Design a protein around this nucleic acid. Structure first.
Lengths: 154, 97, 85, 50, 69
RNA sequence: GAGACCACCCGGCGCGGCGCUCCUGUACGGCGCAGAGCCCUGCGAUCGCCUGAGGGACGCGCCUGCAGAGCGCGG
RNA sequence: GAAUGGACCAACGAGGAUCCCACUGUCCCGAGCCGCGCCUCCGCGAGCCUCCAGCCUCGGGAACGGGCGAGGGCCGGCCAGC
RNA sequence: GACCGCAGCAGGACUCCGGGGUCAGCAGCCUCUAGCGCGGGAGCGAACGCGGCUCAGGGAAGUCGGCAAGCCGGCUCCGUA
RNA sequence: GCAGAGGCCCCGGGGGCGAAGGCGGCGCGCAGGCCCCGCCGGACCGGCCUCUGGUGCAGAUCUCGGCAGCAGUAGCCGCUACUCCGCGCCCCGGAGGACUGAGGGGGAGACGGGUUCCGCGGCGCCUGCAUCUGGCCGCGGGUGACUCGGGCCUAAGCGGCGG
RNA sequence: GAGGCCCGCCGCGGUGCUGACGCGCAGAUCGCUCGUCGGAGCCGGGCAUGGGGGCGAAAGACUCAUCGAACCGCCUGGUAG
RNA sequence: GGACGCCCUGCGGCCGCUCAAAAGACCUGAACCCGGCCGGCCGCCGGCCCGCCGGCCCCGUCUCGAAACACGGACCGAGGAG
């Protein structure tokens, strides 16, 4: 009941993490960027994003995201380099690729990221002290990351 | 590790601040093992732990300026920022006379 | 000045623990328990606050003697009474 | 405070003694499920005798 | 243990309503020993800790060994 | 040469040197038959000389030197 | 208008006015510079508001409309300012 | 550095001891001893804001008003309606 | 239409061969609404007649609970400041550079807190970034007096007094 | 060597910028500037005076962020054309 | 109250296990709200194969008169007044 991608006899490996303490917005974009990529390209893309060589393009949460030179061909001028999100996503995509190799003996080359589902989660609710003796919230926005690897489109 | 217990214990034994206590950069593991004043005293005798000198301010320039003010070199009207009465009180001069 | 700075000057105990009721309500200057009523022989019980009466009343505590005596009257105290009478 | 009264020292003492978590064995014996003293206090947030 | 070996002193938790004369006599009667001095503090937890220094002739190590310390 | 970010104009960049020019104003040191004087034959603020010196540079020219143009991404 | 005090100012005054000298970007008339914030990134992350909706011009209308009547504009999504 | 203000709140809250130099100074400016590097890091060097610095010639013409800045300032000796 | 009460439901109403509830789709009724089917669910539920009522919500600056867009936005602007190397953390050690500058960001008391103290281990929480840090969490300890202070004396004051 | 004398440090006040702040550092702060600084001074502890009362170099100020009459509970689910 | 194997530096994941069922820190699990994937480009009413044409101001409310530049209302669930 925790996996969105309902399998349809495709023999595709799956991994996930629940209550990840990262931004939901900055993790959804990281997973959206890797979708459709061979897991070898995705590992080198995520590594490049950490070295700032490549950029995670933000298609949904773009308000306040700076336009950068690296996002020229992405389809959106806006983009960023989330570091905590990339570390988390890489772990899930390494577990997914390991699960698919052990379960169906697929090769890493013929595995492509096929589906993802980042959902919002309940956050740690710390407090923020405002002026005129008032207390507000500093609630986090954690995420349930789901990464699936599979043969290729068509 | 956190050798803050051993810089507190050695400050007590050497009777100095923890800013004067210096450990050998090497033999750090031996300092880590010590957790008692006696096992700190042993490392002080070994010289693994040592204290620095107070290293206060040089008075060499100050003793030269005072020596030349004794000759009269540095006390002209420009260098006087206090009243003649404040510098030397008339009452004191009358009492001595 | 009226509030935060003046709250800084708060460093004294206006009230203390009551011997009779063990609440932080014994005034140390006037020597009177605001809740207990001590040093008075009688307890301070006011019918305007029935909630105050309910917080400290017979039955809030152990009632160790009364419980014993009530059971004994429902057992063999009544017989001892008739023997004395 | 350094010049404490005995009566005050003894009331404060009980608070330190009763500031203890539920023993793990007691949770197993009573099948408590909820596992927190709640009566526990923290010196910075608590206002004992206030 | 260092106190019992070097300062000939046995540390004993006692009733808080007890007094240094009563502690000295009680330790002497129960342990069959001679006590030169008693020093006592009421712990932060309410208990009373009494440092019983045994007389120089008596050896606290022997009394502690009989006790089980 | 252009700019908040982007974009724009250009690209084997660029770093460190060598000249040129310009900025400040004559470097440390050595020397002196300079120096008020002093007490010692030593001290001494200063002065001249070497020294339009030295130091500096983001401007121009050059390279004598390390370098420098993706099997990165799209396509 | 005379202890509902009248008149009178030496010395005082973070009191209220007027002028002179001095002085300065107050100004003519602005300009360059230095830090910090801003801005971009990494990690954190609120409050407030909210029928909807968010381009105009005219007309009617509770006589001063984003929405109605008639015209004229208008890919859509953002950013820094304002 | 743990108290009291919702908070490990550029907010308050009583005392004790108090080195050196410059100086009239327990002032300001540096320092010995002792303590220590604070709810985070980089890049850039926009407007604008804030905390400053300077500005030709004139000198309050600005403004409700010289607001703000600037001038002046220590000591010694003259000289004072 | 709702919730309960008294009856009925021809062999004694419908139910683990699937009740209520939830979800999607019909049909029926002018409509309030009702009914069926599938799927989830997992133990109860009605039609009709009579009876009873704390009986039907879009508003009340409505109460309470969740929670959106703003929005990865505003912000994380005091107290001069960190750097290199090493198990390398804002830990720690060494080395440079600083700062608080003896009405100290120094060392101690009174009060107020009440274990915050110390050692060992740890990061699930908190440390508004991080943590291998810590005042945080767990465990085990810690305050010794003829001479110091209370106690004692009296002050301002307050209580007591045949009454 | 006098003075409710003057300059000026801490202290104690709080003038101006009609500065910052104003979803603050803060339900009155922060920065400069300023009033004063041997005195009708300042500060701590104890103590007294209590709500139509107190206390007031008087401003209807102050009385625990509350004041032209405190706060707590109750009358009270007061009454409202 | 989670067999075993597979993995992972580890965290944790995947397989499945117990069970009637995960019912897995817990019964059912609505709305608001949001992420994946597939389909469209869209408010309401009417007509038709269905994106075109025609019509349509934001309710509740006092009021002579409210779309009002009058007032209350972000949204949804529960409670809520003869």
């Amino acid at each position: 009941v925790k996996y969105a991608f309902k399998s349809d006899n495709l023999l595709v490996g799956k991994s996930r993490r629940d209550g990840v303490k990262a931004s939901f917005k900055n993790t959804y974009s990281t997973c959206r960027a890797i979708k459709g990529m061979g897991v070898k390209r995705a590992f080198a893309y995520l590594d490049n994003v950490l070295n700032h060589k490549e950029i995670v393009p933000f298609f949904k949460f773009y308000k306040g995201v700076g336009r950068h030179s690296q996002a020229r061909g992405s389809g959106t001028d806006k983009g960023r380099w989330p570091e905590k999100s990339v570390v988390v996503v890489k772990d899930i995509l390494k577990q997914a690729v390991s699960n698919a190799k052990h379960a169906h003996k697929k090769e890493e080359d013929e595995l492509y990221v096929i589906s993802y589902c980042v959902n919002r989660a309940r956050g740690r609710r710390r407090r923020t002290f405002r002026a005129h003796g008032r207390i507000s919230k500093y609630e986090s926005q954690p995420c349930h990351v789901e990464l699936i690897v599979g043969p290729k489109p068509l | 590790a956190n050798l803050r217990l051993q810089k507190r214990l050695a400050a007590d034994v050497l009777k100095c601040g923890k800013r004067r206590v210096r450990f050998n950069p090497a033999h750090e593991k031996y300092i880590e093992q010590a957790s008692s004043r006696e096992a700190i005293r042993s490392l002080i005798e070994s010289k693994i732990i040592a204290k620095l000198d107070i290293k206060g301010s040089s008075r060499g320039r100050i003793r030269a300026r005072h020596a030349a003010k004794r000759l009269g070199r540095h006390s002209g009207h420009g260098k006087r920022r206090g009243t003649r009465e404040a510098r030397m009180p008339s009452k004191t001069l009358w009492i001595q006379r | 000045s009226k509030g935060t700075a003046s709250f800084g000057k708060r460093h004294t105990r206006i009230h203390g623990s009551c011997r009779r009721c063990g609440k932080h309500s014994f005034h140390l200057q006037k020597h009177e328990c605001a809740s207990c009523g001590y040093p008075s022989a009688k307890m301070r019980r006011y019918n305007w606050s029935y909630k105050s009466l309910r917080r400290r009343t017979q039955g809030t505590g152990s009632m160790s003697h009364m419980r014993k005596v009530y059971r004994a009257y429902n057992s063999g105290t009544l017989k001892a009474n008739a023997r004395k009478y | 405070t350094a010049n404490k009264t005995l009566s005050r020292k003894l009331r404060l003492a009980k608070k330190t003694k009763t500031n203890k978590n539920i023993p793990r064995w007691v949770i197993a014996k009573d099948h408590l499920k909820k596992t927190w003293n709640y009566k526990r206090h923290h010196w910075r947030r608590s206002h004992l005798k206030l | 243990t260092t106190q019992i070996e070097k300062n000939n002193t046995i540390v004993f938790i006692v009733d808080r309503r007890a007094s240094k004369p009563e502690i000295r006599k009680a330790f002497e009667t129960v342990f069959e020993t001679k006590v030169a001095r008693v020093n006592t503090l009421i712990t932060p937890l309410g208990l009373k800790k009494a440092f019983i220094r045994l007389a120089p002739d008596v050896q606290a190590m022997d009394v502690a060994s009989k006790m089980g310390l």
